[PDB]
């Protein structure tokens, strides 16, 4: 005695988890914003009441899409630049010993070599100041990348400074944002909203320290796909940024050598004045209190009476074993030994100085056979940044001892994007539905 | 109490509301379904959105529900698909839970609607012949 019939509803607010191709939006640079949709002056956020949604930062396809897009943009930006195939020659290298400090012993090589000119039948004897990491002895040396692939010089007019990028979904798709503070990136989120696209995310490439990122608005946040598994990287998000001041104080001189028709190689001519190591400074008290916050948050996961130890990176490439980043065109690799060196037991104005080594031959992503040569930057360089998080790895894990050791980690830049896209997911709207009603056609 | 008329909750604001309330904002969701590394991240996505919208429109049209957002049909509600009474459906449950519940019987219902529409068209043609 029901006499119910199917009734079709179009426009139903129902969605399903989906993977799609988000497009860029933003307000010469490597991150090509000239092909991005203009961002709306007043973006609209629809706050969904009574909606609880299942989020998982560690399986978000947005991270993979961003990784692919960043790699593609980096490759596109380097296509029209000069390929330094002629640079693979025998180098007559001597030690740069004029006005050098005891920490720059043999770090710079004054290398003379023959080079091609615009005329195919002429050669020019030139010289350049290379870094000890960029050359390998065959007094005879060759560039490190010569036995793997030819390096592409970066176009000098293109800037490496990150620009914020928004990832807006196509029609028929929505971006759900988890507004729940204290959210650890997985599980039900009861405070959900719909956004045309996320906040401006800057593609900051950094290892062992998340830089110029977002800050937790409540307290330090510890996130891990499986915290009990030591093989999973722990993402730490700060609430108070730690100011870091990184400088190369050498007054570098850039000279240009015509290596062919319309092709210029930018060499380091001479350092004007004293030569001393590039470095970084981190406030000691701020770092100590930030580490205390991190320890008190980690105690929730690893017990209240455990010993929390911070030590050096285990080993590997220079990219992962050191805080690797870019500061105004020059690529720093900083020995973060004064930061993660302490023990914590449950119970002024100086700063920690991290020495840094500069590199010109760069392998940004974990790709063998695709290298980039950074032209030297004219003059002293300084940059101030916010440390907003960490990429830690827990050492060991046996139950014999009550001590937990965390070491800096990185290498894979997907984690860097994951720290910014943790509170976002993509869904596809299913507007069609069928319901029972007494109505009959 | 006192009221001043309806309000606008946004694109998917009625997602958490009941089916009776959510059915009053169908057009809001309906009208938002159509609208060199970044430039090619747009063309194929726009094509995909167009194909999805056209698939939905064709699926509605082959049932006789063309150009309608709420459409009654001649297919009886087989109780095996769902045993819930209307009182606990339209006033104490949202559309997301409904989609979770009835995910198994979608295609058979769609085919039933298709064949019912074909029968209706044939019957109308026969009737107008007299």
């Amino acid at each position: 005695a029901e006499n119910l019939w199917v009734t079709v509803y179009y426009g139903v607010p129902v969605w399903k988890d989906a993977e799609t191709t988000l497009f860029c939006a933003s307000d010469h640079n490597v991150w090509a914003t000239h092909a991005c949709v203009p961002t709306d002056p007043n973006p609209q956020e629809i706050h969904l009441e009574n909606v609880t949604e299942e989020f998982n930062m560690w399986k978000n396809n947005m991270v993979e899409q961003m990784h692919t897009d960043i790699i593609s943009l980096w490759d596109q930006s380097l296509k029209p630049c000069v390929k330094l195939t002629p640079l693979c020659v025998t180098l007559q290298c001597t030690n740069v010993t004029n006005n050098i400090t005891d920490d720059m012993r043999g770090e710079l090589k004054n290398c003379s070599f023959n080079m091609t000119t615009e005329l195919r039948d002429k050669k020019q004897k030139v010289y350049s100041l290379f870094y000890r990491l960029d050359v390998v002895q065959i007094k005879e040396y060759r560039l490190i990348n010569c036995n793997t692939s030819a390096c592409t010089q970066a176009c000098p007019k293109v800037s490496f400074e990150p620009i914020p990028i928004h990832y807006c979904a196509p029609a028929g798709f929505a971006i759900l944002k988890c507004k729940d503070k204290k959210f650890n990136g997985t599980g039900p989120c009861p405070s959900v909203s719909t956004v045309q696209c996320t906040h401006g995310i800057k593609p900051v490439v950094s290892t062992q320290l998340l830089l110029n990122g977002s800050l937790a608005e409540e307290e330090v946040m510890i996130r891990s796909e499986n915290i009990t598994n030591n093989a999973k990287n722990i993402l730490v998000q700060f609430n108070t940024p730690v100011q870091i001041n990184c400088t190369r104080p050498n007054n570098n001189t850039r000279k240009s050598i015509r290596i062919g028709p319309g092709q210029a190689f930018y060499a380091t001519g001479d350092i004007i004045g004293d030569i001393r190591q590039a470095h970084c400074n981190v406030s000691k008290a701020t770092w100590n209190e930030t580490l205390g916050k991190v320890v008190k948050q980690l105690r929730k996961h690893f017990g209240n009476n455990t010993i929390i130890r911070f030590a050096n990176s285990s080993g590997g490439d220079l990219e992962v074993t050191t805080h690797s980043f870019n500061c105004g065109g020059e690529f720093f690799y900083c020995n973060t030994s004064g930061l993660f060196n302490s023990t914590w037991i449950s119970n002024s104005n100086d700063s920690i100085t991290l020495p840094c080594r500069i590199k010109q031959i760069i392998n940004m992503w974990q790709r063998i056979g695709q290298c980039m040569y950074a032209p030297p930057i004219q003059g002293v360089i300084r940059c101030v940044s916010n440390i907003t998080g960490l990429i830690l790895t827990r050492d060991g894990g046996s139950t014999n001892s009550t001590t937990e050791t965390f070491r800096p980690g990185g290498g894979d830049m997907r984690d860097n994007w994951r720290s910014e896209l943790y509170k976002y997911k993509v869904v596809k709207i299913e507007p069609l539905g069928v319901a029972p009603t007494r109505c009959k056609r | 109490a006192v009221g001043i008329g309806a309000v606008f909750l946004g694109f998917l604001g009625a997602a958490g509301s009941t089916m009776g309330a959510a059915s009053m904002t169908l057009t809001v969701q309906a009208r938002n379904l159509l609208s060199t590394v970044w430039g090619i991240k747009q063309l194929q996505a726009r094509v995909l959105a167009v194909e999805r919208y056209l698939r939905d429109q064709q699926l509605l049209g082959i049932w006789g529900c063309s150009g309608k957002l709420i459409c009654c049909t001649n297919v009886p509600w087989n109780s095996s698909w769902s045993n819930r009474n209307l009182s606990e459906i339209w006033d104490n449950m949202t559309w997301l839970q409904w989609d979770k519940e009835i995910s198994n019987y979608t295609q058979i219902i769609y085919g039933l609607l298709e064949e019912s529409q074909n029968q209706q068209e044939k019957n109308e043609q026969d009737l107008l012949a007299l």
Partner: antibody
Amino acid sequence: QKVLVQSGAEVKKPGASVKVSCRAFGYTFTGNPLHWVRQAPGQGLEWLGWINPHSGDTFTSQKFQGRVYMTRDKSINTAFLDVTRLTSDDTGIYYCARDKYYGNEAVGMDVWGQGTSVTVSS
Amino acid sequence: DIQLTQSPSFLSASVGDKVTITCRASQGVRNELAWYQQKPGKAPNLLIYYASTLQSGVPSRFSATGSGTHFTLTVSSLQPEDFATYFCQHMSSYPLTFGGGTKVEIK
């Protein structure tokens, strides 16, 4: 997350006009109506009226018609109350409050602004 | 207008005791009632809507019952931060009017 923020305190001479702003955060501005209420120093709350941000319709108390006006701008998610012909009896804290508005009718004011203090004296 | 009267205007009680405050309406309102709490020199906060439903985040010790003209707000167990001005407000017809104001004081 639901928050309402108003402008600063106002001091005016009698007979002037005062504009009290109210911007919303954490919820859809057009999705709920906004009550305007006032509390005098040491007195109770007096209900001035309420506005619908979506349709723009307004209602004012019968003992306030022709004196107080209400408007909204959805581009910045703000509601404005304009009180004219100020007097010494108009002193107090003006509050803008979001109504729960379940079922398209008044249910209760749950989110309140910080309160704008308006003073009137010679 | 519609008159809302409250009893008691003032009340002295100890922590842990029970408080019952009555709102009486001259005209009949079925469930069109809201109970609020306002602290000295601070914005008011909602306690009850529909005269029987707690606002989200309100402690469960609060409760209210009543239909028509007689309504009661009950604090089952007094708490130190529960001392404030209690208001009852109707919304059946314009204008909306608030109660006189009930103040609970420690003993």
